Amino acid sequence: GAMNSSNYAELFNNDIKLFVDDTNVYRVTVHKTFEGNVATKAINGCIFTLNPKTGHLFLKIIHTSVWAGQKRLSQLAKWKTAEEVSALVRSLPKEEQPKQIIVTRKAMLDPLEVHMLDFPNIAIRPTELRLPFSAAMSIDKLSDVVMKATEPQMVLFNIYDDWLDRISSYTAFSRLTLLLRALKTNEESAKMILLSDPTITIKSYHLWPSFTDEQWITIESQMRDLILTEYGRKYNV
Amino acid sequence: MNTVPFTSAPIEVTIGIDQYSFNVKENQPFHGIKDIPIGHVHVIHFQHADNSSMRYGYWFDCRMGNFYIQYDPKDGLYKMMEERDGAKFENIVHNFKERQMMVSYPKIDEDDTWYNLTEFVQMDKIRKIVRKDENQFSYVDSSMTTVQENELSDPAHSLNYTVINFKSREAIRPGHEMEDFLDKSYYLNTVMLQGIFKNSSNYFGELQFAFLNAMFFGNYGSSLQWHAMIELICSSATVPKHMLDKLDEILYYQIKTLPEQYSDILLNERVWNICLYSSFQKNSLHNTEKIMENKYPELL
Numbered sequence: 001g002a003m004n005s006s007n008y009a010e011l012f013n014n015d016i017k018l019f020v021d022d023t024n025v026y027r028v029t030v031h032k033t034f035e036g037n038v039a040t041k042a043i044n045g046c047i048f049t050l051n052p053k054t055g056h057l058f059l060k061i062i063h064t065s066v067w068a069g070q071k072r073l074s075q076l077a078k079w080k081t082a083e084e085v086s087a088l089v090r091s092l093p094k095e096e097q098p099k100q101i102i103v104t105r106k107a108m109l110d111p112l113e114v115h116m117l118d119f120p121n122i123a124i125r126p127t128e129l130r131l132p133f134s135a136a137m138s139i140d141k142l143s144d145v146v147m148k149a150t151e152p153q154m155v156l157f158n159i160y161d162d163w164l165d166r167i168s169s170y171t172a173f174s175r176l177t178l179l180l181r182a183l184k185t186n187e188e189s190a191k192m193i194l195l196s197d198p199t200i201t202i203k204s205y206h207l208w209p210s211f212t213d214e215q216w217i218t219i220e221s222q223m224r225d226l227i228l229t230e231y232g233r234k235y236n237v
Numbered sequence: 238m239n240t241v242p243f244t245s246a247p248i249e250v251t252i253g254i255d256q257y258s259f260n261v262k263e264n265q266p267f268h269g270i271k272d273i274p275i276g277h278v279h280v281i282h283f284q285h286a287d288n289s290s291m292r293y294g295y296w297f298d299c300r301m302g303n304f305y306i307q308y309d310p311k312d313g314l315y316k317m318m319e320e321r322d323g324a325k326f327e328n329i330v331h332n333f334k335e336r337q338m339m340v341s342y343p344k345i346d347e348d349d350t351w352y353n354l355t356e357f358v359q360m361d362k363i364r365k366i367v368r369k370d371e372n373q374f375s376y377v378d379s380s381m382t383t384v385q386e387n388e389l390s391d392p393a394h395s396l397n398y399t400v401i402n403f404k405s406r407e408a409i410r411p412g413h414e415m416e417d418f419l420d421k422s423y424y425l426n427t428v429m430l431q432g433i434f435k436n437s438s439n440y441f442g443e444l445q446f447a448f449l450n451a452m453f454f455g456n457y458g459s460s461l462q463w464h465a466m467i468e469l470i471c472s473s474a475t476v477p478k479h480m481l482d483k484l485d486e487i488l489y490y491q492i493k494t495l496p497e498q499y500s501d502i503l504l505n506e507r508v509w510n511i512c513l514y515s516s517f518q519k520n521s522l523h524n525t526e527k528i529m530e531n532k533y534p535e536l537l
């Protein structure tokens with residue numbers, strides 16, 4: 001059924017599974033019109049589809065042309081997400097298709113179930129976790145590829161860079177969510193933390209800097225302080 | 238006018254005939270019901286005084302043969318049977334009538350209730366939903382399950398209603414996923430009306446039969462089927478104008494008939510609020526919305 005703190009280790013077992021987050025699928029800027037009314041301009045977006053065990057990120061870039069002439073875009077976005085996830089599954093060899101797909105928002109359940117009726121053995125599930133995947137557009141290289149796209153495009157990343165060489169997927173995911181949580185709560189501070197030391201660089205084939213184990217521990221502590229810091233600033237504590 | 242004689246009434250029982258109920262006491266001199274309007278289906282139905290568990294009953298049409306009721310002390314229920322000896326039957330009935338051992342179907346002459354609840358119900362269609370082909374009448378009870386309930390267990394004793402499932406491949410065309418799920422006109426008009434029911438009269442007949450089973454026996458699967466068939470219409474953007482007018486009339490008389498005390502379990506809050514206030518047809522059921530708001534404003 002739903003995914004929560006009790007069955008959190010299921011994410012890292014050997015049953016193939018994907019998280020789907022649709023929060024950056026339909027993105028807009030709101031602005032005033034010459035007449036003084038308000039209007040939206042869409043900008044490119046992405047479906048965020050992640051294997052939590054391997055780190056494989058299937059970034060489906062959503063070009064603004066897919067909204068042209070369409071109505072009720074926030075509802076269409078959910079059906080377009082589901083369509084694209086269904087096409088991704090269908091493109092994968094049977095032995096690579098997920099046994100479960102976990103959607104980060106419950107509004108995705110019915111769109112995805114309907115698009116996957118052909119796959120009655122793939123379980124579509126919600127989660128009680130509050131995952132910070134909306135912050136994925138704060139990762140510069142993922143933001144850059146979405147905003148540069150001139151047509152629909154799928155780009156494949158490993159959001160864990162080479163971490164699994166040294167840590168488990170449980171720890172890699174915990175690091176990812178703590179980084180994304182920090183970027184979501186205070187992007188400027190988070191980026192400042194991540195880049196303050198120019199001797200630590202991001203390899204061209206990576207998204208995050210090349211920290212040693214010890215430097216990751218420091219980094220992880222500073223992200224926790226930031227999250228705690230902002231929690232105080234927010235609530236006056 | 239036609240008659241359903243009873244051999245006897247050995248156990249105290251609540252007898253339902255269509256929308257009416259009356260009490261017979263253990264070993265009372267009761268020998269049946271007379272003046273039953275020819276021309277409609279009917280349902281006789283029972284609720285034992287000593288075990289209100291399992292209401293049960295029989296759908297029949299008096300034009301299709303001479304039927305009577307006889308208590309069976311082994312199976313412990315009032316059973317419908319057919320008398321094939323016509324002259325025996327007329328003789329039996331005439332005697333009971335002369336001795337005034339029969340209550341009379343007391344149809345008020347201003348009253349079109351039963352017709353309005355069974356307008357599209359046909360015995361032949363009932364017999365396909367309730368499979369037991371050696372009898373001309375059809376037994377139903379509170380606990381019988383539906384074909385769809387068994388998919389989600391004795392297939393001979395099932396209600397074979399038409400399976401409706403909005404998240405099924407039958408309901409959803411490849412490539413039109415969002416269109417067909419948010420507006421179910423394809424599923425209603427092409428799959429169900431043209432494909433399965435052939436016309437809206439058979440569709441309405443099943444819907445009416447499902448409600449009646451739902452209200453008379455508290456058959457839960459029947460209640461699910463009734464609500465499903467309403468929701469399929471209300472959720473279709475394109476519905477023939479005459480179907481909507483008829484559906485409004487059908488639902489109006491079902492709600493009017495629905496006893497006030499029985500509404501908390503027979504009326505699905507989600508389906509009705511959706512149908513009356515959110516769906517495509519939210520403005521097309523004036524009579525039904527007016528009676529629902531005045532009779533059951535709690536549910537809304």
Ligand SMILES: CONC(=O)COc1ccc(C)cc1OC
Binds near residue numbers: 254453494495
């Ligand atoms: C318990 O009373 N005898 C029944 O069988 C009652 O079940 C019914 C429910 C609702 C209505 C309008 C009529 C009914 O049949 C008479």
Ligand SMILES: CONC(=O)COc1ccc(C)cc1OC
Binds near residue numbers: 254259270340
């Ligand atoms: C209006 O009639 N009064 C009712 O509602 C219930 O009374 C009966 C109804 C039907 C039949 C066959 C017999 C009845 O009592 C013997």
